[PDB]
Design a protein around this motif. Structure first.
Motif: not given
Lengths: 216, 214
Positions: B138, B140, B122-123, B179-181, B136, B165-169, B183, B185
Motif C-alpha cells: 500500500v 499513500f 509506502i507499506f 489524497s489517494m491510496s 498487498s 487498485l486506486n482510491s481517491w478522497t 494498492t 496485490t
C-alpha cells in the motif's frame, strides 16, 4: 438522535425488505415522515411521505408498488417496504421530518444502505500497517468484506485530524478499504495507536494495535 | 412533475471570495399567497443533507449569515459570501410547491488553493496477511493539489501495471487538498520471489523498501 435507521440491509434479488426509522420524542403522530433515495455517487430522489396520526400517504408515481409506507404509532417507528428488488434498487435510503414548530429545521436519519445481491455476508480481515523497518504515518487495511459499509476509527476517535480513510473498492465481489493516520514522530511508538473496525452486517468489531516491525 | 435544473455540475471559488450557485424550475414556484417554495441543501460526503434556505430567501437555523438566497418565480440563486474551506460539498435545490417533491442534480463547490506536492508513504504487507496466501503493498499519496496525479509501481526495477487498485478522497474540508491510496496485490509466493518494491508519484517522488530488510 432524532431519527434512527440501521446501517445496512443485504437482500436477494426478487425478495423484499422492510426498512425502519425510529423517531425520538413525543410528536411522532403530528409530523410527516419523508423517504428519499440516493444511489452511490448520484443525486437525491423523493419517494413519498406518510402522516403517522392518520396514515395518509403521498407517493411519487415512480415508486408506486415498489414502495409501501406504514407506521407503528405504538413504538413511534415508520417503515418503508421495498418489493421485487433489482440491482437498480441498491442505494442509500433516508427518512426525514420537519420540526414540529419551526420550518427552518429538518431532521434526517443516517440512511440505510441496501445492497441487492446473491452473495453472502463476509466479515473483514483487518491488517495493521507499521512503517518500513518529524512525523510518522501508519496504516490499516480492511480486506475482503461484503456488503458495505464498515466504520473505522483510530484510538476510538481520539485521533482524527491526521486521518485519511479512503472509499472502498470492489474486486472479485469483495470490498477492500484502507486508512492512514499521520502524527508527530514522538507520538508513536511511544504511545499506543489502534485501528478500530466495525462491520455491523456481520456483527463484528475488531481492534488492531500497530506495532513496530520486527525480524519476523 | 416540476423539473429542477442545475446546469453547472461544479463551480470553483477562491477562499475568502463570494460564489453564486444557480437553479431553475420548469413552472413558477411563486404561490398566490406571495411565497416562493424553493429550498437549498448542502450535502457533505458521507453525511446526510443539511437545510440551508427555506422558501427561497429564509435562512435556516444554525446556518451562518454568509449564506443567502434570491430569485424570481422560475430562476433562483444561492449566494455564499467570503467562502471558507469548510463549505466544500454538493449543493441541491428542491421544490416544495407540489407533489411529488423534486431535486435539482446538484452542483459541487470546489475550493482553489496553492499547488502542493504529495506526502508519500509506502507499506509492505502485514505478516498476518501473508498467512492468507495474499500480499498487498500500500502506498499513500497524501494532501496534494491539484486533484490529478499519477502513480507507477516497479518490482525489482520493472514497471508493474496489473494488480493495482486506486482510491481517491473528496476535497479536504480544512486544507482543501486531495489524497489517494494505491494498492498492489500479488500472491504470497510472487511477493516472496522478489525483493525491491517501489511507489512513484508524478504530480517524481519515490518511496521504496526491500522485503528482507528487517
Amino acid at each position: 438522535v432524532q431519527l434512527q435507521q440501521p446501517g445496512a440491509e443485504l437482500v436477494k434479488p426478487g425478495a423484499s425488505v422492510k426498512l425502519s426509522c425510529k423517531a425520538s420524542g413525543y410528536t411522532f403522530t403530528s409530523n410527516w415522515i419523508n423517504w428519499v433515495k440516493q444511489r452511490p455517487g448520484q443525486g437525491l430522489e423523493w419517494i413519498g411521505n406518510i402522516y403517522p396520526g392518520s396514515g395518509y400517504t403521498n407517493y411519487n408515481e415512480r415508486f408506486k408498488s415498489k414502495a409501501t409506507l406504514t407506521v407503528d404509532t405504538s413504538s413511534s417507528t415508520a417503515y418503508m417496504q421495498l418489493s421485487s428488488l433489482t440491482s437498480d434498487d441498491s442505494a442509500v435510503y433516508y427518512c426525514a421530518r420537519k420540526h414540529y414548530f419551526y420550518d427552518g429545521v429538518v431532521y434526517w436519519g443516517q440512511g440505510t444502505l441496501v445492497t441487492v445481491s446473491a452473495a453472502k455476508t463476509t466479515a473483514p480481515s483487518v491488517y495493521p500497517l507499521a512503517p518500513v523497518c518529524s512525523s510518522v504515518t501508519l496504516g490499516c487495511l480492511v480486506k475482503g468484506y461484503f456488503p458495505e459499509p464498515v466504520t473505522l476509527t483510530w484510538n476510538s476517535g481520539s485521533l482524527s485530524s491526521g486521518v485519511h480513510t479512503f472509499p472502498a473498492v470492489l474486486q472479485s465481489d469483495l470490498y477492500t478499504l484502507s486508512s492512514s493516520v499521520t502524527v508527530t514522530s514522538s507520538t508513536w511508538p511511544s504511545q499506543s495507536i489502534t485501528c478500530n473496525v466495525a462491520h455491523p452486517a456481520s456483527s463484528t468489531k475488531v481492534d488492531k494495535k500497530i506495532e513496530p516491525r520486527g525480524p519476523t | 412533475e416540476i423539473v429542477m435544473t442545475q446546469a453547472a455540475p461544479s463551480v470553483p471559488v477562491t477562499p475568502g471570495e463570494s460564489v453564486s450557485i444557480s437553479c431553475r424550475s420548469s413552472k413558477s414556484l411563486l404561490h398566490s399567497n406571495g411565497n416562493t417554495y424553493l429550498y437549498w441543501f448542502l450535502q457533505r460526503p458521507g453525511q446526510s443533507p443539511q437545510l440551508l434556505i427555506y422558501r427561497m430567501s429564509n435562512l435556516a437555523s444554525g446556518v451562518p449569515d454568509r449564506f443567502s438566497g434570491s430569485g424570481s418565480g422560475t430562476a433562483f440563486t444561492l449566494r455564499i459570501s467570503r467562502v471558507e474551506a469548510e463549505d466544500v460539498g454538493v449543493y441541491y435545490c428542491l421544490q416544495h410547491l407540489e407533489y411529488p417533491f423534486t431535486f435539482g442534480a446538484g452542483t459541487k463547490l470546489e475550493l482553489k488553493r496553492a499547488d502542493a506536492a504529495p506526502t508519500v508513504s509506502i507499506f509492505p504487507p502485514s505478516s498476518e496477511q501473508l498467512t492468507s496466501g495474499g500480499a498487498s503493498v500500500v502506498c499513500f499519496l497524501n494532501n496534494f493539489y491539484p486533484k490529478d496525479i499519477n502513480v507507477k509501481w516497479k518490482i525489482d526495477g520493472s514497471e508493474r501495471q496489473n494488480g493495482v487498485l486506486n482510491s481517491w478522497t473528496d476535497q479536504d474540508s480544512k486544507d482543501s487538498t486531495y489524497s489517494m491510496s494505491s494498492t498492489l496485490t500479488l500472491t504470497k509466493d510472487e511477493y516472496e520471489r522478489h525483493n525491491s518494491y517501489t511507489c512513484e508519484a508524478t504530480h517524481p517522488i519515490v518511496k521504496s523498501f526491500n522485503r528482507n530488510e528487517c
